Design an enzyme around this catalytic site. Structure first.
Site, short mmCIF file in Angstrom:
data_model
loop_
_atom_site.label_atom_id
_atom_site.label_comp_id
_atom_site.label_asym_id
_atom_site.label_seq_id
_atom_site.Cartn_x
_atom_site.Cartn_y
_atom_site.Cartn_z
CB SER A 15 -1.03 -0.04 1.11
OG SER A 15 -0.41 -0.16 2.34
CG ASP A 219 -1.65 4.54 9.32
OD1 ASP A 219 -0.52 5.05 9.16
OD2 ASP A 219 -2.29 4.05 8.34
CG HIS A 222 -0.28 3.30 5.27
ND1 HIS A 222 -1.22 2.94 6.21
CD2 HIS A 222 0.03 2.18 4.59
CE1 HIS A 222 -1.48 1.65 6.09
NE2 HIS A 222 -0.73 1.17 5.11
#
Length: 244
Positions: A15, A219, A222
């Site tokens: 991601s 988070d 990322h």
């Protein structure tokens, strides 16, 4: 109808290649949404194209993986910043960059073995991208946050990455195809073993840029959009300095 690309880059991994810069959970309704903040380093250009999921070249815009990393809300990755930096340093009116997004969020490297769905999708999209006559100039790979969770995965990462590169070069019949990989910035767990494997891999025409220290989203996992601009610029610097 864009003029087709002549310099093609394959973008793959999980991601942080697919892109999550600027993706925030809406406090009103809990939906994840890309904030649509686009740094000028990521600005679109008629000479920077993207191969869509339906295999058409189109002018490239972030998020580059919307129709590829399906079922996940995408934001900014390193691709446009990379492409603008390369296009600008080339200073050649004729150069047309093509990006082939292939990344898939949440995937460990076992999901990229030769024969797997994701690996075969990457190879098929790369072969499709060549039909316009353009040359594959490099593969940009940023993956490994999913391999830190289990020591067996972290301890095999370097062997798996060596095999992935050998496989791609073989299946595309490009024995010297440049690979630029990214030593992961985040993930916890056995991150240090995965980073050691990435930074320690020594193979012809493979280089590793380090994402350690780049800003992380709330988070702690990322890269932010501004980190992704920094990473895309670093990936362009590595491409330009080693392979041009």
């Amino acid at each position: 109808s864009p003029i087709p690309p002549n310099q093609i880059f394959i973008l793959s991994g999980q991601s942080n290649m697919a892109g999550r810069g600027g993706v925030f959970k809406d406090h009103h309704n809990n939906r994840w949404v890309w904030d649509k903040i686009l740094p000028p380093e990521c600005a679109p250009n008629s000479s920077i194209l993207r191969l869509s999921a339906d295999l058409r070249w189109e002018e490239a815009h972030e998020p580059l993986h919307v129709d590829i990393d399906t079922g996940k809300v995408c934001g900014v990755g390193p691709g446009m910043a990379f492409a603008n930096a390369v296009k600008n340093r080339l200073e050649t009116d004729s150069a047309v960059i093509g990006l082939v997004p292939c990344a898939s969020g949440g995937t460990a490297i076992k999901e990229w073995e030769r024969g797997s769905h994701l690996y075969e999708r990457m190879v098929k999209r790369t072969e499709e991208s060549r039909k316009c006559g353009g040359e594959i100039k490099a593969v940009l790979w940023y993956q490994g946050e999913s391999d830190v969770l289990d020591i067996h995965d972290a301890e095999s990462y370097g062997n798996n990455m060596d095999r992935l590169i050998k496989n791609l070069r073989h299946d595309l019949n490009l024995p010297s195809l440049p690979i630029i990989q990214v030593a992961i910035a985040s993930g916890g767990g056995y991150i240090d073993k995965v980073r050691e494997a990435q930074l320690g891999l020594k193979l012809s025409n493979v280089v590793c840029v380090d994402a350690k220290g780049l800003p992380l989203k709330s988070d702690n996992l990322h890269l932010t959009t501004e980190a992704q601009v920094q990473l895309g610029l670093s990936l362009a610097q590595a491409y330009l300095s080693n392979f041009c």
